[PDB]
Amino acid sequence: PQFSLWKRPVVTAYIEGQPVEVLLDTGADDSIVAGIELGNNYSPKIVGGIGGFINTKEYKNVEIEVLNKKVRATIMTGDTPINIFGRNILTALGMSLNL
Amino acid sequence: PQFSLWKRPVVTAYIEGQPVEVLLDTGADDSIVAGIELGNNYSPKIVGGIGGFINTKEYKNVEIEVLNKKVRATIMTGDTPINIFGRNILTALGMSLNL
Numbered sequence: 001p002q003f004s005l006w007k008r009p010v011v012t013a014y015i016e017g018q019p020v021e022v023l024l025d026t027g028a029d030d031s032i033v034a035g036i037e038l039g040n041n042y043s044p045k046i047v048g049g050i051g052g053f054i055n056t057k058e059y060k061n062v063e064i065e066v067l068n069k070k071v072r073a074t075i076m077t078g079d080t081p082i083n084i085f086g087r088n089i090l091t092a093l094g095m096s097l098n099l
Numbered sequence: 100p101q102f103s104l105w106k107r108p109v110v111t112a113y114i115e116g117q118p119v120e121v122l123l124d125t126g127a128d129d130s131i132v133a134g135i136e137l138g139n140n141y142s143p144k145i146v147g148g149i150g151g152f153i154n155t156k157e158y159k160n161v162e163i164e165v166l167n168k169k170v171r172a173t174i175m176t177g178d179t180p181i182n183i184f185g186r187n188i189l190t191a192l193g194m195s196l197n198l
């Protein structure tokens with residue numbers, strides 16, 4: 001798969017079996033999804049971006065299926081305008097930015 | 100050029116002759132740079148990120164030298180922790196995400 005960047009590179013991922021549309025983001029170090037409930041075993045974290053920080057709940061070894069791949073990775077949940085898959089998952093999937 | 104995403108994909112660009120370190124960001128729709136004076140010709144824009152909103156100055160037809168290409172693109176200027184090259188510039192360079 002190859003993504004031109006004319007439109008946002010957004011795909012469907014399944015997090016713990018629930019589908020979420022996510023943005024593939026080389027500018028995000030980690031990943032953060034909204035609207036999913038992952039349970040009580042998390043560590044509190046903060047994440048920053050343009051405009052300030054948000055509180056997040058960090059979850060480890062989450063089961064993800066994306067791009068016909070299956071990984072386990074850390075995901076944060078939080079009030080994010082769009083769901084972001086940062087370089088933590090992208091590296092696990094084997095994606096690169098090419099010119 | 101191919102960037103694995105183990106490290107942040109940060110490069111040196113020249114904006115109207117001035118060297119800046121920038122992040123190549125597929126999740127940013129637009130581009131925002133701090134610490135450079137572009138000129139008087141701007142419109143003030145509002146820009147939304149993870150934490151909240153920021154006021155910026157938009158510059159059109161700014162000349163950029165990056166990754167061996169020269170482009171002219173729109174660049175905003177603002178209170179940004181990291182200089183960002185988002186999709187407008189990525190598309191113009193012929194960059195893609197690949198799996």
Ligand SMILES: Cc1cccc(C)c1OCC(=O)N[C@@H](Cc1ccccc1)[C@H](O)CN1CC[C@@H](S(=O)(=O)c2ccncc2)C[C@H]1C(=O)NC(C)(C)C
Pocket residue numbers: 025026027028029030031032047048049050080081082084086124126127128129130131146147148149150180181183185
């Ligand atoms: C999630 C994460 C974990 C650990 C480290 C980082 C850096 C993270 O990412 C946060 C972020 O905001 N990253 C953005 C780049 C960044 C990094 C560091 C500091 C500042 C900015 C992102 O790639 C690009 N994002 C993706 C999220 C969308 S959004 O969901 O928030 C949104 C979209 C439209 N309207 C409102 C909000 C906004 C957009 C961005 O800031 N874009 C501009 C740079 C053009 C402002």
